[PDB]
């Protein structure tokens, strides 16, 4: 009845107010900056030893050690400077889709199709690695569980819900609801008081940790959203979708700024990441390659070729000196 | 220097793990509700035939949208598809599903084994007469007449039809796409067969043999 017509008028007011603050555009302001030029990078290392394809990877805080996951049922910790193997951990379930590394370097977490993000202890007194806790409160598979500190974690699942746990007692504290489809990714703000998520209903939301309520809703895409990440200064973020396009949003203006599309690309994006300064944007594709874009001008400036299957993960070190990419052909490469 | 030695002993253990991984023959089982998917075959199941190991999985623990988690099973040996071939009101739905799996982009090199269960029911329950054509699925009697096989000695011509019905439509979709990289192996079953572990053994042997003959320019 009137509950459908009333919501229609509210949507009109929000759209009308946005046009008032749309005086100029980002494209016509940065027209005096010199372009970057041409960026060339080449492979330096190749890590091999996994038995099947790779889904996830994560860098350490000290920027020397990283952890990777595979669906053969292993979890290997590498030494990037010398390509030495430090640890090897077998898992109970073969189907694993995510992994994380604790900021202090004492714990590692993982999860997958078994509806559990479990925690491992590394600094044991007996000389081995043992399981510490098991958190089970979800109904659908887990796609991302990320550490906050040494005592609490935040997870996203495929039942359209996020949660905040407490490792000491194993009971969750806060539940975030409001999405429509599966939640595919999340990203923490640098100040560690807000985070964003992207679901399969072509929208993104902004939450706050202390309260547990939604703040803003952004919508400019046409299909599912796969990747998301924050700007270095914590006032903007970028997304990637299945319509072969990346977009940039502003929190203060609550609207869109730029679009990164090309006429010869007809495949979706699987991962995005920023550089240390924030001027270059990296993206992985299903046509076996990766592209480098100029954030302030939206024109391509490079390419990385050499993988055999599609790239599934991508990361940049804390000090911004190297890039690591995984793929479905079970290899890891380090560029520059 | 002593840390390089430790790294080499980790690699010897990984070599022994690769020997067992290669001879395992993982399988995927997916069907529909009220299809008798359980009695024919608990996420994981183990069985051994002629000292050969098999491992089969069931993923009945999520919602009804499966366009995201189905991309994990892109390198299994085969897929088992189960159909409750006794009801006609829900038979058009079963065809659509098959069509989405066959034409998917990430599952272009995987073969499918087809089981047409619920045979004893259709022998007599529907033979008495409670359904016809143009009132239910109008494609099992579009003037069909096959002459290549008449098994089961002793019956009138319309016995296997209610299970023979489904055979043609799944072959219309199968033979119209896919050059030489995957095939289909239909089977007829029931609720008391004890030889279903042998049919999988034989059908998995033809998949490996056909793959080697093609790369030697012999097939």
């Amino acid at each position, epitope marked *: 009845d009137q509950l459908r017509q009333e919501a229609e008028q509210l949507k009109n007011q929000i759209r009308d107010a946005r046009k008032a603050c749309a005086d100029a555009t980002l494209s016509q302001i940065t027209n005096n900056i010199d372009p970057v030029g041409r960026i060339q990078m080449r492979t330096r290392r190749t890590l091999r030893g996994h038995l099947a394809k790779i889904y996830a990877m994560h860098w350490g805080t000290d920027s020397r050690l990283l952890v990777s996951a595979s669906q053969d049922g292993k979890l290997i910790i590498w030494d990037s400077y010398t390509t030495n193997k430090v640890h090897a951990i077998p898992l109970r379930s073969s189907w694993v889709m995510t992994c994380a590394y604790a900021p202090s370097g004492n714990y590692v977490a993982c999860g997958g199709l078994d509806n559990i993000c479990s925690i491992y202890n590394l600094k044991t007194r007996e000389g081995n690695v043992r399981v510490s806790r098991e958190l089970a409160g979800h109904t659908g598979y887990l796609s991302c569980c990320r550490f906050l500190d040494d005592n609490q974690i935040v997870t996203s699942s495929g039942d359209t819900t996020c949660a905040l746990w407490d490792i000491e007692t194993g009971q969750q504290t806060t539940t975030f609801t409001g999405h*429509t489809g599966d939640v595919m990714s999340l990203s923490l703000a640098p100040d560690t008081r807000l985070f964003v998520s992207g679901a399969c209903d072509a929208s993104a939301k902004l939450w706050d940790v202390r309260e547990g309520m939604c703040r803003q809703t952004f919508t400019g895409h046409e299909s599912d959203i796969n990747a998301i990440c924050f700007f270095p200064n914590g006032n903007a973020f970028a997304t990637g979708s299945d319509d072969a396009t990346c977009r940039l949003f502003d929190l203060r203006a609550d609207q869109e700024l730029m679009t990164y599309s090309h006429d010869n690309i007809i495949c979706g994006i699987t991962s995005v990441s920023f550089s240390k300064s924030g001027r270059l944007l990296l993206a992985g594709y299903d046509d076996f390659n990766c592209n480098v874009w100029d954030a302030l001008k939206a024109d391509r400036a490079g390419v990385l070729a050499g993988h055999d299957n599609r790239v599934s993960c991508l990361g940049v070190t804390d000090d911004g000196m190297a890039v690591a990419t995984g793929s479905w052909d079970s290899f890891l490469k380090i560029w520059n | 220097k002593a840390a390089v030695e430790r790294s080499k002993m980790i690699e010897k253990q990984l070599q022994k793990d690769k020997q067992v991984y290669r001879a395992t023959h993982r399988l995927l089982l997916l069907g529909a509700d009220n299809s008798g998917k359980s009695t024919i075959v608990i996420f994981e199941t183990k069985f051994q035939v002629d000292k050969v190991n098999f491992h089969m999985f069931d993923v009945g623990g999520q919602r009804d949208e499966r366009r995201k988690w189905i991309q994990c099973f892109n390198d299994v040996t085969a897929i088992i598809f189960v159909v409750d071939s006794s009801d006609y009101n829900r038979l058009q739905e079963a065809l*659509n599903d098959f069509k989405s799996i066959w034409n998917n982009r990430w599952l272009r090199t995987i073969s499918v084994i087809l089981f047409l269960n619920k045979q004893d029911l259709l022998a007599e329950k529907v033979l008495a007469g409670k359904s016809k054509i143009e009132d239910y*699925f109008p494609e099992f009697a579009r003037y069909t007449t096959p002459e290549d096989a008449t098994p089961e000695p002793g019956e009138d011509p319309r016995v296997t039809r209610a299970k023979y019905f489904i055979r043609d439509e799944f072959l219309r979709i199968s033979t119209a796409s896919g050059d030489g990289r995957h095939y289909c192996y239909p089977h007829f079953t029931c609720a008391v067969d004890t030889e279903n572990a042998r049919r999988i053994f034989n059908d998995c042997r033809d998949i490996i043999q056909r793959m080697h003959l093609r790369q030697y320019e012999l097939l």
Partner: nanobody
Amino acid sequence: QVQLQESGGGLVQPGGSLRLSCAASGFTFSNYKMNWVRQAPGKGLEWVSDISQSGASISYTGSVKGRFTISRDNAKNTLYLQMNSLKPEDTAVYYCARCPAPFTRDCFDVTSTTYAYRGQGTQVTVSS
């Protein structure tokens, strides 16, 4: 915004005819596959028909062959459906769904009440 809106529908006599349209906005209409879905009173959802990106491949379900027609207009972002000689068992609610992942030849839709890209529906009643 991927808004989809349907127009038409109402009380009809047996043997009557109706005409429906599905206006669309918020995406490039000439890159996706479109289709119709209906839901009977107190039952599930049943796929009905679909049309390819250009208008070359057309499919129907077995129960409506010879009575339904589908067509699209790429220059106006519309989708049509023609009905003839309706039977009393045609009373249902008709929706207008869109396939995701453009430049692709399969769909994963007609799930339970959780699909994002779908319309609201219009009421059709054929009785006397």
